[PDB]
């Protein structure tokens, strides 16, 4: 403490030394399956110990075009970690992020079509999370992707939802099961109007048989508010923050 | 492993034990002053040691109307540390984040005035950084805030600039000196088109005598590309990540 580094170099390095640190943050059910649901996050270690800020290294990956490759790393390890977990008696789902790069590249889903069945990973055991931004920007390719995943018995999820001018139009074309509401709706919950906004959103999503995930549950009070709002899924530090191990007791 | 907790409480438990940890990320000059320039950041320690994610506790803060309280804590201790550092011999500037909450509050200017006079902090020593989104959402209050900030001999900054429909329109009504460009512009710069876009953005920013700050300089290469683009300030982990102390050798 404290220091710096060539993050692009460290990225290209960690792709080989496999220095990448995989984290998990549980997604809790309120109205959905029992199951076990983790969102997998990616943290990176600098050569001298401390971890580099995720915004910084995520941008590094995009500046070097590395994006998709990094995704393919995660997607790999996750599956392995899943084969170690699903074949341990727990039936769990993983929420894995996809970058715009991975979204656009057509070779992704074929490449994936050699990795799962290499570990005999159960159907509907994997959820690919793409931002609403990347969803709207590259819509066609998103549609194609999600339909492919549908054929491969995987599930789609859209994060940071509810920000685009007409957030729902985007839905009409792609095959998505989970919708993860943007944290902006969870802002200023002490006011009733906001709660009503949230409830309206989640209800609209429920008419469309989508599974509402709401992040940032930071107190029991907030959990209450979100249950009242009708969120079918829920995620927060008060439940459990990002951790090294898929440890969370779901009962 | 593993980490969990009522963050709202912790914030209400940090605001008087002063458990908050203030970080610093240097803003390097390429074409601006030879000041020392830091952006102050905020980290939170849970009671049992490890640090809780920033998105987590910032959202926690917004959920319970703690936002402006925290902003004022940061402002205070920034005034203090700047007194201890600038009196030491250094001549530094601080970029301090303001939340939407603080933006809306009208007592912020008077309270700030008293806090400033209480420490005899030099003119043009503080830079208040609000996001383009927040400035656009609360335009008149952003105008009044910046107008008042001018009289206190403080400076202003718009961050995440360039994503709104017509980014330069809001700038007409604001008294701002530093414009911090959104990181989306510093992605895939290996493409020539993006380079052209960035160069244009910075060029028009220069035509309005604004000082462009570009973040996520993740390698020497990117630094080169940004100097080319015409950025007057830069910031990145290749230069220096968030540190516990204002250590950066600016020469």
From TrEMBL, chains A, B:
Q: Does the keyword Metal-binding apply?
A: yes
Annotated Mg(2+) 1 binding lies at 6
Occurrences of domain EAL (ranges):
4-251
GO cellular component: a single term: plasma membrane
Signal peptide interval:
none
Q: Does this entry carry the keyword Nucleotide-binding?
A: yes
One GO term (biological process): regulation of DNA-templated transcription
Record-annotated residues binding Mg(2+) 2?
39
Q: Which domain of life is it from?
A: Bacteria
Sites where the protein binds 3',3'-c-di-GMP: 25, 42-43, 71, 160, 216, 218, 237
Task: Identify the keywords attached in UniProt to this record, alphabetized.
Answer: Metal-binding, Nucleotide-binding
- State any single GO MF term: nucleotide binding
Name of this protein: FimX
Lineage of the native species?
A: Bacteria, Pseudomonadati, Pseudomonadota, Gammaproteobacteria, Pseudomonadales
Instruction: Identify the gene encoding this protein.
Output: fimX
Q: Which residues of the full protein are shown?
A: 437 to 687 of 691
């Amino acid at each position: 403490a404290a220091q710096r580094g060539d993050v692009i170099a460290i990225l290209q390095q960690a792709l080989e030394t496999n220095s990448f640190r995989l984290l998990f943050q549980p997604v809790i059910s309120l109205r959905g399956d029992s199951h076990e649901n983790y969102e997998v996050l990616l943290r990176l270690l600098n050569p001298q110990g401390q971890e580099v800020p995720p915004a910084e290294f995520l941008h590094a990956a995009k500046e070097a075009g590395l994006a998709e490759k990094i995704d393919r790393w995660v997607i790999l390890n996750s599956i392995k970690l899943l084969a170690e977990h699903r074949a341990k008696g727990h039936q769990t789902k993983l929420f894995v992020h996809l970058s715009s790069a991975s979204l656009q590249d057509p070779g992704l889903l074929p490449w994936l079509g050699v990795a799962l069945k290499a570990a005999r990973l159960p159907p509907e055991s994997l959820v690919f999370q793409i931002s609403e931004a990347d969803a709207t920007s590259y819509l066609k390719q998103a549609k194609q992707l999600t339909q492919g995943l549908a054929t491969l018995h995987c599930q789609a999820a859209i994060s940071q939802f509810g920000c685009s001018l007409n957030p729902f139009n985007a839905l009409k074309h792609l095959t998505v099961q989970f919708i993860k509401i943007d944290g902006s709706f969870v802002q200023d919950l002490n006011q009733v109007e906001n709660q009503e906004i949230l409830k309206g959103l989640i209800a609209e999503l429920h008419e469309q048989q989508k599974l509402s995930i709401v992040p940032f549950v930071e107190s029991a009070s907030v959990l209450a508010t979100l249950w009242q709002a009708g969120a079918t899924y829920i995620q927060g530090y008060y439940l459990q923050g990002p951790s090294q191990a898929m440890d969370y007791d779901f009962s």
